[PDB]
Design a protein around this ligand. Structure first.
Ligand SMILES: CC(C(=O)NCCNC(=O)CCNC(=O)[C@H](O)C(C)(C)COP(=O)(O)OP(=O)(O)OC[C@H]1O[C@@H](n2cnc3c(N)ncnc32)[C@H](O)[C@@H]1OP(=O)(O)O)=[N+]([O-])[O-]
Ligand SMILES: CC(C(=O)NCCNC(=O)CCNC(=O)[C@H](O)C(C)(C)COP(=O)(O)OP(=O)(O)OC[C@H]1O[C@@H](n2cnc3c(N)ncnc32)[C@H](O)[C@@H]1OP(=O)(O)O)=[N+]([O-])[O-]
Ligand SMILES: CC(C(=O)NCCNC(=O)CCNC(=O)[C@H](O)C(C)(C)COP(=O)(O)OP(=O)(O)OC[C@H]1O[C@@H](n2cnc3c(N)ncnc32)[C@H](O)[C@@H]1OP(=O)(O)O)=[N+]([O-])[O-]
Ligand SMILES: CC(C(=O)NCCNC(=O)CCNC(=O)[C@H](O)C(C)(C)COP(=O)(O)OP(=O)(O)OC[C@H]1O[C@@H](n2cnc3c(N)ncnc32)[C@H](O)[C@@H]1OP(=O)(O)O)=[N+]([O-])[O-]
Ligand SMILES: CC(C(=O)NCCNC(=O)CCNC(=O)[C@H](O)C(C)(C)COP(=O)(O)OP(=O)(O)OC[C@H]1O[C@@H](n2cnc3c(N)ncnc32)[C@H](O)[C@@H]1OP(=O)(O)O)=[N+]([O-])[O-]
Ligand SMILES: CC(C(=O)NCCNC(=O)CCNC(=O)[C@H](O)C(C)(C)COP(=O)(O)OP(=O)(O)OC[C@H]1O[C@@H](n2cnc3c(N)ncnc32)[C@H](O)[C@@H]1OP(=O)(O)O)=[N+]([O-])[O-]
Ligand SMILES: CC(C(=O)NCCNC(=O)CCNC(=O)[C@H](O)C(C)(C)COP(=O)(O)OP(=O)(O)OC[C@H]1O[C@@H](n2cnc3c(N)ncnc32)[C@H](O)[C@@H]1OP(=O)(O)O)=[N+]([O-])[O-]
Ligand SMILES: CC(C(=O)NCCNC(=O)CCNC(=O)[C@H](O)C(C)(C)COP(=O)(O)OP(=O)(O)OC[C@H]1O[C@@H](n2cnc3c(N)ncnc32)[C@H](O)[C@@H]1OP(=O)(O)O)=[N+]([O-])[O-]
Ligand SMILES: [K+]
Ligand SMILES: [K+]
Ligand code: NI
Ligand code: NI
Lengths: 260, 260, 260, 260, 260, 260
């Protein structure tokens, strides 16, 4: 059993349901460690497809990164072993398909988390925002890359630069979602597709998923370019604005950004 | 003349029509060798645009890889000089635009074949499936990469992991197709576009096509990553599941996959 | 302050308006030098978002490359320091969002220019074409790469190989545009999005934009592939067809291309 | 204990000594499994430097790949999980320096193995050969790359194309070896260098070793190039020459190669 | 015109002499800023070649990184705008050849600095060491890469893992140095070569140097590999060993490293 | 027969001897066309090794690129189809070893040509120079890359920036040559090694040569880097210095370079 998730398996399909609603399923270390343990426990030959979901009737699918656990001490907020960074790698390397079944609003790191999964099926009332420019966070290269494989560059830059929510209808139209259904059809539609996938050849699915993962990462650059980017990110996480972003969030007020 | 295609030339446009209805235009070696000979013969300055089509009225555009020619046991079924691998490279390197004009159902390797062409114009009643997970086939890197340049990652993964057919309307909406037209207008519509392209500067078209080919291919990885992927693909084509998929296809029964 | 653009600032938003209507805002060296000086002058902490536009009522947003300024006699027409190549780099490296607010028709290098910007909001009556195959021009790798980050390969190849205009509605559908609005609403809609972006964290916006730029460029090739392409481009700029394409534009007649 | 190796620790230095002299320390699966187990068991904070050696007085350091374990059956002889391929990866990813201390003759896969290690210190009487052209073996990309980081291309090609042994003195002159010493001084010279390295910062050593490993692997190519090489390798392991080379070695006669 | 360097111009050759003897030409910000200003001021068409030197008679060419300025606690010591990182970029991008003319002992960052220059001519009594493993420093990817273009991997790993000094004779034998001369001949030999270079075509020299720079940097990797290495680097600069290495250097005692 | 080369076959070895003494075996278009035709004619299974040589007693091995065939200005002098660019690709792709057997002086493009071959065996009196900085020529990336796989960067930069000849003894010490022998021993020393290689497995040699070729080329960069380099090379071939370099050679005088 798990403190922060609930797992139900029938036949070859496992549903991992978030159980962290008192914190709006924020991506706290304790929540992510339990989600990763649950996925690892399901890495068995008789499990063929995973669904990730919030409880039925959730207003908020996930509030994203826990803003209390963001470092404000001049440390990289999105280093390789940060919980958000660990869960996106683990989803992408997992040798079974992972479907995000979305009811409610999706924020920031949680939007990256569902974009790292294999398919997204969403309620017609679900909404999606990408929020680092609301907090002054310098998103990392891997995290940004995870957002660029579905919608085009102009659409991705609108989502990030405005931090404005988009509807499930627009998220379908721009190529982010696989399917949008009425919320009362969401579970039945998603289970039908998951159980269908579980009848197909699992070893062929696993190697094709791994081929897609490698090709998706195969945007290569030299060491100088990476180190130049890391210097730019460091200047951001050393900024007055980054302190103001976090301060405004916990004081429940609007940040005032100034460009330092 | 050719045993397995019929070629017609109208000014600067060449139409190559499959003549392999006996096997529903399956990508047999003898069919692909005639298709490649026909294209090579058309590599002349006075030809400016190619159309690939099945005969008018076809229910099946192409049934995909000839399953009777797929290597059994531990032989790579999608090696460099396999017919499907040869025709996709030839289409992509050919210095004139190649338009796939689609009537009927499109399966597996024939879907990768039309995706490798420059433009796809299809009948409102045409349908599209990608089927290696039905058979347990470890699709190759180059073949998967050919499926990723039009629709986004989540859509591609739905197509491959479900092996379910999509309509021409959905294939248009997700960016696979250029145009969908009523079947009685398909030929006229496609020829009008081909004649129009044929008025443009062919050397400019050829170098821009090759620039897009090179950029499309420019997802680079180290030797270890390629050899690791090759080891995973060999484990799949060595598996009981691969034998079961091939056998189930031939015996016309549902395969029973077990994950080894 | 500039001969060929007008700049107005509204709180933290700067609007750079073309003032070259006597040449339909063609991308002449004198125009681009003024556009680049205006952008450089706006790289100030109190400026948070840029809008590029043509004057209200413009039938032609930009007629594209100044065809009089293209070299004739066996010279690369799209070298690293040609004005179109300079302005796309400058837009992409600029540390503030640049929104292209489009009224009227967009041609050739002007289409590449708006594609290189961060967001595109367009009038319902605006139209878009990519024209090098009309003139026999061997477009450069960087230039072509700039057209491939929004719509899929089949769509881009139709746009380039036909040189046919598409509508604002089709450009929205295929992923080129962010928004299409009635022309009477175009300025207010674009200014409210720009003001909204202007309240977000500028340093987070600048590092995410730069991360997207270098991931966008990170399609890598070996020296031989680049030099093989450059040799193909030189055969095109040495061709009879290239001279005929330039001649026909200047003599206002239909070119006759022959494939050498 | 181990059946096929003997381990001695001298404070922070561990010496792994081959114990397979009855098969001239050929790289059979049982010998390599024991070497990898002994390395894995030494991956402890109190160990800082490894030495690999043959027993004192060995005329043969290692006879290379066990030719009885080379598959002939149209199967890739150097696939990702073959013992030679496993041991070179493990030596390179091991977070402590590994020094090859060589007495006797070094052959084929055993030469690649010492090349994959961090330093090579050798007896003045030791000799070195790279032998796949004697057998008709299509050596794999990773394996060849492991031979190209010390001596230059012309020297590597002489070694491989001639399969002729070189002296310790020539191996020093061309950059393959760190040091050549009289056999009576070999053990002490090597131990003093290992003890000296063991006084330095182990975390600094490990991250610099890992940085050198990933820069050394960072020669990148597209999927088509890898698949094209793999097709060429398969044609070699399907060849009559390959069968002739294996049979000639086992029958102790000169092979007769004919080029198919 | 400079506090910390002296500049002598002989025909088209400029000789930049270090004037920071108080810290044995350690790479303090104040010294490096004056070295970079002097180089910038020499970027004129009438200057064709640069020589970098310590004063005639120097025991110590440069004592390396200023250990008093290296950030301690959890700050990256080798960030993009650290003085050593700036000076190696500037030397490599400088459009004239830069010859390191070496008398005395060369340590750590000063060794990387001379390795980044175009040619090295040294006195027979000069000596060379690479020192990060004496301090527990996690050297950065670009810094390590700068050390791998002259001697082979085994030799570079000996230099870095031992931090032992090598003689000029050995540095010449492994390919680090161009020439070794008696100290009395150092100025005559170096100036003769610099004068000879200055009669050659400067624009051909500049573009070839820049071609070599970009080919040298063209070892590419994906974002995940870079972020993984940066996480490992951060674990080292957070370590107790790193604090011990810095403290031991400042207290002029032997460090005791423990592996955390 | 051939107008400009003489070919002899000794068992399985073919010796191609230059016959263009009248321009000292300068790499004129018609000379290189016959060398390439002679190689193609020898691409047969009963030939296993090629030797390239000048006639016995030659003072000049080859005077390098034919300076008279270089363009006068405003054109790239080393385009993909140039004869030097053609012969180095053909040597590198040729599926049999090519040994350069060198007697006399080797200049410029002929030095690149022998560097592109597999092995170099040279007379003790032979000499070697790299000459583009004598003429003001902007060497191409592929050409420079062909000079970097044997000697280190410092040595290569000395050779190119000085254009000074080096001895066979120095070329051996820095890793350019395989062997140096007295001129009376050169022919039979080289034939002994070629006969020995000719008894080895030719398919294994061919796939290993090709693996080394693609690994050598696998230094990758983005389109913007390449086009930036090309623009810099264009500024050189457009310069006054390039025309001065060509004029000085024609007028048999020392050039006066001024840096524009
Ligand atoms: C990777 C990344 C990232 O993941 N950033 C975090 C992105 N998340 C967000 O921007 C969403 C932040 N929260 C909200 O917008 C709203 O809380 C919302 C999710 C719509 C739920 O609104 P709702 O009215 O239902 O509840 P609220 O009154 O807003 O807030 C409910 C409580 O949850 C807290 N909370 C909400 N989200 C978070 C979070 N992500 N981290 C920490 N606390 C949170 C609020 O501070 C309140 O705290 P407290 O007053 O009890 O101490 N990034 O780059 O920024
Ligand atoms: O259910 P769903 O439609 O989601 O997916 P499937 O069951 O795989 O697909 C429904 C059927 O359409 C077939 N199909 C697959 N690809 C295609 C295609 N390109 N066009 C037409 N039919 C196709 C499948 O073989 C199924 O065959 P059969 O079981 O009827 O013999
Ligand atoms: C690259 C790849 C790939 O290309 N795989 C193959 C993908 N192709 C398919 O899955 C489609 C397989 N075929 C079918 O679904 C059906 O034949 C269909 C195309 C719907 C047409 O049905 P239709 O009723 O009109 O004809 P069928 O009864 O299904 O089949 C008529 C015959 O054609 C054979 N056949 C059909 N497609 C193929 C094929 N691709 N290869 C070999 N034989 C085939 C069947 O096995 C039958 O053999 P036989 O009983 O006459 O000896 N992959 O990775 O798997
Ligand atoms: C990068 C690239 C590129 O940018 N190519 C250029 C792409 N641009 C174009 O194809 C548009 C060319 N022009 C046109 O299509 C039409 O001018 C159009 C924009 C529809 C406007 O029609 P309109 O009926 O008003 O014609 P005008 O207003 O008279 O245009 C006024 C003059 O502008 C000239 N002109 C138009 N576009 C251009 C241009 N790009 N360069 C130079 N002159 C131009 C016409 O030839 C007229 O010459 P002249 O009569 O004064 O001697 N490329 O690869 O090709
Ligand atoms: O036929 P299709 O419409 O498919 O393609 P086009 O003929 O090139 O497009 C129809 C016309 O639109 C023009 N056109 C090209 N680009 C554009 C654009 N961005 N906006 C408006 N018109 C354009 C062409 O020059 C044609 O005019 P004209 O040369 O015939 O006077
Ligand atoms: C990866 C790779 C590779 O690793 N190739 C293998 C490269 N190995 C070689 O070329 C070593 C060839 N062997 C020799 O030169 C000599 O056997 C040798 C290493 C010098 C020592 O000679 P010595 O005179 O002491 O002993 P030998 O009489 O030659 O041989 C002693 C016995 O060991 C066997 N043997 C030697 N090397 C091997 C091997 N690598 N695998 C299996 N058996 C071997 C011989 O066939 C004899 O078998 P048997 O007939 O008694 O059953 N490759 O690509 O080729
Ligand atoms: C990049 C990197 C790196 O660069 N590491 C640093 C590597 N450098 C070293 O290990 C050499 C450190 N310095 C020394 O060992 C000695 O100064 C040595 C070069 C042997 C010369 O000894 P000598 O007795 O002649 O001269 P010293 O009195 O030690 O040194 C003369 C003065 O320069 C200072 N100094 C010398 N080296 C350094 C340095 N690297 N950083 C800061 N100050 C230094 C000393 O503290 C003295 O200052 P002060 O005590 O008068 O205020 N790394 O990764 O580690
Ligand atoms: C790629 C590249 C390159 O390959 N450059 C070319 C590099 N080659 C050189 O710099 C060598 C130029 N030539 C010389 O230095 C001398 O000719 C040398 C090879 C030392 C031989 O001196 P030598 O006094 O014996 O004989 P020469 O009479 O000078 O030369 C015999 C004739 O061949 C011509 N020749 C010699 N080298 C070349 C050449 N590379 N191109 C064209 N003609 C040449 C001379 O101009 C003579 O013409 P003519 O006077 O009969 O009409 N690059 O970038 O520069
Ligand atoms: K709004
Ligand atoms: K300054
Ligand atoms: Ni990509
Ligand atoms: Ni390299």
């Amino acid at each position: 059993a798990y403190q922060y998730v609930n797992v139900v398996t029938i036949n070859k399909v496992a549903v991992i349901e978030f159980n962290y609603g008192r914190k709006l399923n924020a991506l706290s270390k304790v929540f992510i460690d339990d989600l990763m343990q649950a996925l690892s426990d399901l890495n068995r030959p008789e499990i063929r497809c995973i669904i990730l979901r919030a409880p039925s009737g959730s207003k908020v699918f996930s509030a994203g990164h826990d803003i209390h656990e963001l470092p404000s001490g001049g440390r990289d907020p999105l280093s390789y072993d940060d919980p958000l960074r660990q869960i996106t790698r683990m989803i992408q390397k997992f040798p079974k398909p992972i479907i995000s079944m979305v009811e409610g609003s999706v924020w920031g790191g949680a939007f990256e988390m569902i974009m790292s999964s294999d398919l997204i099926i969403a309620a017609s009332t679900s909404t999606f925002s990408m929020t680092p420019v609301n907090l002054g966070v310098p998103y990392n290269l891997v995290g940004i890359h995870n957002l660029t494989r579905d919608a085009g560059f102009h659409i991705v830059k609108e989502l990030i630069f405005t931090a404005s929510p988009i509807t499930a209808q627009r998220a379908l139209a721009v190529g982010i979602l696989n399917h949008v259904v009425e919320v009362e059809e969401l579970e039945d539609f998603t289970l039908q597709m998951a159980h269908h996938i579980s009848e197909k050849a699992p070893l062929a699915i696993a190697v094709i998923k791994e081929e897609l993962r490698v090709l998706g990462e195969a945007h290569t650059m030299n060491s100088d370019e990476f180190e130049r980017i890391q210097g730019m990110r460091r200047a951001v996480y050393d900024s007055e604005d980054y302190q103001e972003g976090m301060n405004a969030f916990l004081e429940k007020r609007k940040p005032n950004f100034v460009g330092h």
